[PDB]
Amino acid sequence: DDTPPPPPFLAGAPQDVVKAFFELLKKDETKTDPEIEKDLDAWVDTLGGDYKAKFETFKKEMKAKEAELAKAHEEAVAKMTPEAKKADAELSKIAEDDSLNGIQKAQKIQAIYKTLPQSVKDELEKGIGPAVPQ
């Protein structure tokens, strides 16, 4: 089938660590490959061992899958709805550079702006829909 890795991301550690890995994994058993490996890597950054090579290769593989998906999805989205272009542009730039944060603000602004007509702006300009029907 198509499922994430069930083994330890940091394969090589003792039973004391294998319990922490499994107890963490049973909570994210229903997540994706990059979503599990992220959480595993976050605590692995405090271990310090050969698992560093698995991190370097993982970050590339994840960034590669995400960037390629985001490129294809963005290409098809360019002929679609305008809000979709904004979301997919954010997803495409972040999928090559996760260290570039703060764009989440402008992505939210655009996503709401495409669904902020003059009707809702005028009804909320006075407050919270002052005596307005369904």
Identify the experimental approach. Answer: NMR
CA 65/CA 50 separation, integer angstroms: 24
- Residue ranges per structural domain of the chain: 1-134
Contact 39, 27 (CB under 8 A): no
Buried b vs exposed e over 39-78: b needs ≥16 C-beta within 10 Å? bbbeebeeeeeebeebbeebeeebbeebbeebeebbeebe
Residue where the block lists tokens 């090579």: 53
CA 40/CA 77 separation, integer angstroms: 33
